[PDB]
Structure formats: C-alpha cells, structure tokens
Amino acid sequence: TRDANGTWEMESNENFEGWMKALDIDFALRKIAVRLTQTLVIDQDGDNFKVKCTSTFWNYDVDFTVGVEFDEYTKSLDNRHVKALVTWEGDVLVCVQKGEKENRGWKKWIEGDKLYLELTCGDQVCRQVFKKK
Numbered sequence: 001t002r003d004a005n006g007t008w009e010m011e012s013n014e015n016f017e018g019w020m021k022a023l024d025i026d027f028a029l030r031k032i033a034v035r036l037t038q039t040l041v042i043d044q045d046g047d048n049f050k051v052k053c054t055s056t057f058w059n060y061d062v063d064f065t066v067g068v069e070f071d072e073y074t075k076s077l078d079n080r081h082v083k084a085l086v087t088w089e090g091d092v093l094v095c096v097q098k099g100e101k102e103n104r105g106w107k108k109w110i111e112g113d114k115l116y117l118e119l120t121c122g123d124q125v126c127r128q129v130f131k132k133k
C-alpha cells in the first residue's frame with residue numbers, strides 16, 4: 001500500500017552494524033546502538049511526511065515533501081550534508097541522498113501491517129522489518 005502512517009515496532013534488523021560502519025559511525029557508539037529498542041512513528045498527509053525514529057538517547061527525524069529535493073544534515077548520525085529526494089516508484093517510497101557516499105538512501109515497502117525498510121550506504125544494505133502497533 002502507500003499508507004505508511006502509524007507507530008511501527010521493530011521485528012528485525014539485519015546488517016545494522018555494517019550499514020553504520022559504512023556511514024563512519026564510531027565503533028564504540030555502534031555497540032550501544034545495537035542494543036537499543038527503536039520505535040518508528042510516521043505521519044503522512046498527502047505529500048508531506050514527518051518521520052521520527054526514537055530510542056532512549058538517540059533519535060533520527062526527517063520531514064519532507066514527496067518530489068521536493070531538500071537539504072538534509074544528518075546531525076545525529078554521520079553529520080554530513082546530503083541533497084535528499086523522496087519519490088514513489090509504484091508503491092515503494094524511495095529516498096536517494098546525493099553526497100559523499102555512493103548509493104546512499106533508503107526504501108520503504110508497506111505490506112499490510114508490515115513495513116520493510118532497506119537503508120543503503122556504499123556496498124552495505126541494512127534490512128529492517130516493523131509491524132504496525
């Protein structure tokens with residue numbers, strides 16, 4: 001479907017550490033991030049999204065409009081400037097983040113009550129699955 005609204009609880013996360021290493025997140029921090037439970041809340045109104053991924057001390061938020069490139073500064077992650085763009089490819093929500101890292105971005109597949117999220121950087125893919133609470 002295209003309706004990603006909801007509160008999404010993590011069911012699985014594969015290759016998180018490889019993806020974080022490809023972004024250059026500090027090794028010591030990685031070993032903390034791997035322990036943290038993540039909650040993903042998405043508010044979607046037309047083209048307008050507000051995405052909030054939260055854990056006890058570490059969050060990632062992004063707000064965007066589909067089809068509108070935006071300057072993103074990943075201040076809580078690797079602290080880089082990218083030019084980000086989120087588009088629909090059929091029912092897949094696709095983000096490409098142009099900048100230093102190649103093949104950087106993410107894709108969301110919504111399948112009923114499930115959300116599949118693939119985060120890419122370089123040659124690494126992290127595959128996550130969430131279920132709608």
Ligand SMILES: *C/C=C(C)/C=C/C=C(C)/C=C/C1=C(C)CCCC1(C)C
Pocket residue numbers: 020033036038051053054055058059060077106108117
């Ligand atoms: C559509 C959903 C998206 C783009 C979710 C993105 C979430 C992240 C990039 C979360 C990253 C985090 C870490 C790399 C370390 C631990 C803290 C998190 C979960 C906020």
